[PDB]
Design a protein around this ligand. Structure first.
Ligand SMILES: [Ca+2]
Ligand SMILES: [Ca+2]
Ligand SMILES: [Ca+2]
Ligand SMILES: [Ca+2]
Lengths: 654, 654
């Protein structure tokens, strides 16, 4: 087990001594302002190792951070004891340390004229047992995730918390999915109902989990605390309606107006990628279904090649517009800026993942006769490329309903197998291609790209869409994903350790933009599943009422289930909110105790009716010192006897 | 202006001296436990006037109540000053006084073997200017509503707060409703779109208002504070997860199972009243459209009579099942119990308000040929009643599309005119029928029924449904309601003063069950409006895709609008939440100030790098007292020069 003695590493690129010298000078000038530097130069770049020296001054600032999170209400309970050191009964976590030091570096104390990067070093002692403990376990448990938060941060931890919860919830659709395949058969208007029910439950259950996880880890509402973006544009300056501190304001409704440009942008993405995919599918159909002579196996790869080149090209242009629109929307914090860029990308992600299936489930199988003009276009086009005047050999276009079965097999099996290779082996091959001791490790680590949690998130989010929308045509899909995900926990944990550098500890109280992404796929999957069932069942397909009634019920079945699930979950206890409420209440009570001396809420008693009587006297006396208004038959019994006399009096009349 | 000197009045029924005497004795025995009694007997019943004597002991308990609402988090800020009397800078409000005294009476200190009632007396001085100030104003303002809360309570105030907000929001559909009638015409697939958009906006905006209103009046979350029901059934006893006090527990999921019986109950209500209304409508059609000889004007009233007798009879039985089911569901607090009974009643309310229109807009006009079997039933039935063997004269059933126009005129104009008479004149006639001074006023007041806010709520809630659902066939409906509501504010205020006794001051943070009622009518009104437009437009009516596509778009238009409106309103500032957050933060900060002496959050400075250096020494010294691990080139410049030497060193290789 190799050890480390450094907190952070900062490499400064060396181009020309004029600017590179200036870079090294003032960078050093600033770091020593609060932190120690040892600078050994390797791999053509000087490496500025930075760690916190004084632990007394550091524990003084970590404690100040604990207080800060409390003051804005992120942290439920004040660190009231005021003993900075004995408050390490809740010790400084490695993630908490690395984050706060990274703050000191990357607060307004730096960012510095093209510094290559800033990153902490891994812990091989920890990384070894990590992949070991998880490869021995069949089932992970919350303590493991808490450990992940401790070394890496909540941003990384939440993914594994999500992946884990999604894995176990993925057991259920694997059950009645296998059951639907075994008994009910394909295109079941029953598996579809169970699918929507499940998607609602898992999602609504996960949202409840994020709250509890935020409370346990103490990051609830951390989204509205992080440093604002440098390139955030502000018109004027006012006071924070909560803190009272000077905050820079930008009209929220003016941002809303700019965000309306996502509607034509999304349409631009659906058209661009959509046309690209529907075209390559038309080639796929023409060369396979419509023969076209020898070399078919060679030609079979041709439409696939168009996808490989076209997808990054077409979407690459669209992303430039996405990145451009993103800045225009002008987000205050870095958290919101990247979360919105992901939402913009999701439209591209949706197209490049499902449009092949939409083409099959709504155009190919249920109709297909509308593909004839597309086929003829390739007929004449193939004739020109042939150079020979003779027509290419042709056979009748025959609709194959097994197309939806083969494509689904790829997405659930083959594409997941080439995934394991691309996500792990290809970066591992890259390392093999590259092929004191600390410094050598430092250089090798310095290469590796920063771990992007977004990449791992969509892989599972897009996969969920396959279940929610198109698994009704392949009910064994949940089973394939369930197996992959068990490996996915291990595999993703493995690539963080060796295929990527240690990411900066970063905090969030949710999976973020992926929530709405999941919510959309689940809803669309209620329409998608039922419509597919009706159309791909294969009586004449009366699109008029037949398709629409099927969608009407299943979509409304989804909506009713949603209200039902939320209602039930709303009457269940939530530890995260309850943990908050109990602490807040005791804090409220203790203050009450202190001021009013442990008399916190007796009854006066009847004997004190004498003091009531004496007080009633005093009003009379003051009034006397000063007509029907002040009439009183004082005394307890005196009023009783009068009424009693009235009792027999009133019966006398009768 | 007649004055009053009493806080509360308690009449004890006088049947037989044996029990009535016992009633008067111990009731007096208990009241004097904390409150004064003067007992004058009138109208065959003894009247026990009750008011608080000691103002020092009363201000001691009002202050204890201010603290209680704080402790559970209802009240944002502690009454920290601890001066009970100088905290009357926020004075005891008449509603606050009357409520707290009513608590002392009606806490576990009473309820008492058939006491007739418990109620405060009106304030004629206040009631006079009330109806005066509002009958002079064209526009009410928030200060007026605040005054209503002060004298009557939040329960009463919220209605007028809702009615006022609903009145001004009702201006908008009156505008493009008049515009649709003036220009676009009936059954406009554009007014319908504007209708759904408005319903979403008004509703979502009002929900935002309730939060701010709750904060302003300091009743936010008061629903979970009020006394539990006596007949609440509990299995075991545990600790409150917040307070830690012994609370009685009843399994929430067991209540959910019982609440599932609302589904067959609702169906039972729709069938019972529905069959009753669809039948009376069949008579209405037969005697008018299908002639049936002389006496038609006399016979015309006959189907109306069936409604008058049948509705309270049929729904009266259904309510017995509702009241029965309500108790089975076993609600902890009185607040939740009555709110669920209202929800059950709403199904009956919906039927008795719209089924006549549904019959017209979906059965009569667009089809009508399915009414022939219903007509023949009345044909033979009328023949038997005639006693003469000769057939009743008959003419061809002709569908009249003006039916939907006449019914809508009634609901918007005529029914609102007979409303003013029924809601105000009829109780006033009752008073005229009935036809010291305080005591006489007391007796007369003692008769009057307690004001029920529920009655006034549904009148506006059911009215809203006419707009959301059926106003597309009569776009001038919003105009009729707009006028009525201006009067409704005045009229309802007038009947509270003279037609009903003063209600017990009661607190709530929302309109309650009516929220979901409004939410349902708005959604169903998106389906209802569009379906009516397509069906009642009058090409052949292709129900298959024509009806369903129309519903698909308009419902999804509603759903998209909802997400749009919520999104926009979520990025708007909310005073009620912000008022809460700012106070909480300052409270948080001040405690911080006190313990750590106004050092609440500087930078160390470079010169202190000397203390950094000395601390770095000490670790070395301890290590010395105890291989590559501890290597340091200490000093700021020493590290700079080494790296600098490396700079020219690395270029030498190149
Ligand atoms: Ca993978
Ligand atoms: Ca992954
Ligand atoms: Ca009225
Ligand atoms: Ca009313």
């Amino acid at each position: 087990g190799v050890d480390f003695v450094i907190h952070y590493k900062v490499p400064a690129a060396e181009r020309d001594e004029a600017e590179a010298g200036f870079v090294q000078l003032i960078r050093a000038l600033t770091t020593v302002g609060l932190a120690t530097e040892v600078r050994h130069g390797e791999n053509e770049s000087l490496l500025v190792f930075v760690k916190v020296a004084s632990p007394d001054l550091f524990a003084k600032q970590v404690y100040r951070a604990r207080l800060g999170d409390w003051l804005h209400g992120v942290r439920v309970s004040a660190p009231h004891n005021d003993i900075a050191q004995a408050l390490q009964d809740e010790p400084v976590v490695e993630a908490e340390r690395l984050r706060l030091i990274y703050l000191m570096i990357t607060k307004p104390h730096n960012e510095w004229k093209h510094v290559e990067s800033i990153f902490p070093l891994h812990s091989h002692s920890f990384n070894k047992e990590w992949i070991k403990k998880w490869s021995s376990k069949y089932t992970l448990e919350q303590t493991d995730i808490d450990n992940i938060r401790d070394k890496f941060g909540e941003s990384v931890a939440f993914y594994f918390a999500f992946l884990r919860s999604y894995f176990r919830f993925l057991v259920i659709p694997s059950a009645f999915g296998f059951g639907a395949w075994l008994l009910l058969g394909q295109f079941s208007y029953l598996y579809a109902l169970l699918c929507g029910l499940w998607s609602v439950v898992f999602f609504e259950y996960w949202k409840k989990q994020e709250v509890d996880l935020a409370v346990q880890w103490g990051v609830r509402g951390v989204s509205s605390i992080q440093q604002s973006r440098p390139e955030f544009e502000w018109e004027h300056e006012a006071e924070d309606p909560i803190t009272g501190e000077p905050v820079k304001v930008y009209p929220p409704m003016k941002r809303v107006k700019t965000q309306l440009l996502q509607i034509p942008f999304a349409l631009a993405c659906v058209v661009a990628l959509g046309a690209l995919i529907v075209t390559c599918n038309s080639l796929e159909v023409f060369i396979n279904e419509v023969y076209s002579g020898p070399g078919k196996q060679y030609l079979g790869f041709l439409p696939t090649i168009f996808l490989v080149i076209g997808t990054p090209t077409i979407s690459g242009v669209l992303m430039g517009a996405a990145e451009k629109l993103n800045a225009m929307e002008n987000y205050a914090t870095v958290d919101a800026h990247d979360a919105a860029l992901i939402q913009k990308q999701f439209v591209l992600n949706f197209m490049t993942s499902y449009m092949a299936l939409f083409f099959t489930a709504f155009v190919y199988i249920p109709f297909g006769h509308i593909l004839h003009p597309f086929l003829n276009f390739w007929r004449a086009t193939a004739q020109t490329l042939t150079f020979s005047e003779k027509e290419l050999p042709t056979r009748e276009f025959q609709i194959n309903p097994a197309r939806i079965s083969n494509q689904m097999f790829y997405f659930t099996v083959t594409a997941q197998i080439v995934n394991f290779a691309t996500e792990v082996v290809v970066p591992y091959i890259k390392q093999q291609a590259f092929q004191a001791e600390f410094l050598q490790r430092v250089r090798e680590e310095c290469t590796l790209e920063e771990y992007d949690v977004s990449g791992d998130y969509r892989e599972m989010v897009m996969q969920f869409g396959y279940v929610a929308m198109f698994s009704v045509a392949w009910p064994l899909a949940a089973c394939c994903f369930l197996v992959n995900n068990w490996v996915e926990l291990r595999s993703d944990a493995l690539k963080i350790a060796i295929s990527s550098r240690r990411p900066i500890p970063w905090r969030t109280d949710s999976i973020g933009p992926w929530l709405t992404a999941l919510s959309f796929l689940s809803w669309l999957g209620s329409i998608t599943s039922s419509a597919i069932v009706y159309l791909c069942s294969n009586a004449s397909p009366l699109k008029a009422w037949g398709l629409l009634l099927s969608i009407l019920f299943a979509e409304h079945f989804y909506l009713v289930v949603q209200l039902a699930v939320r209602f039930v979950l709303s009457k269940l206890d939530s530890p995260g909110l309850q943990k908050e409420r109990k602490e807040r209440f005791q804090t409220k009570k203790r203050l009450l105790q202190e001021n009013l001396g442990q008399d916190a809420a007796a009854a006066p008693g009847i004997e004190h009716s004498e003091k009531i009587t004496r007080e009633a006297l005093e009003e009379e006396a003051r009034q006397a010192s000063i007509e029907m208004f002040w009439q009183r038959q004082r005394g307890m019994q005196e009023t009783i006897e009068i009424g009693r006399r009235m009792i027999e009096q009133q019966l006398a009349a009768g």
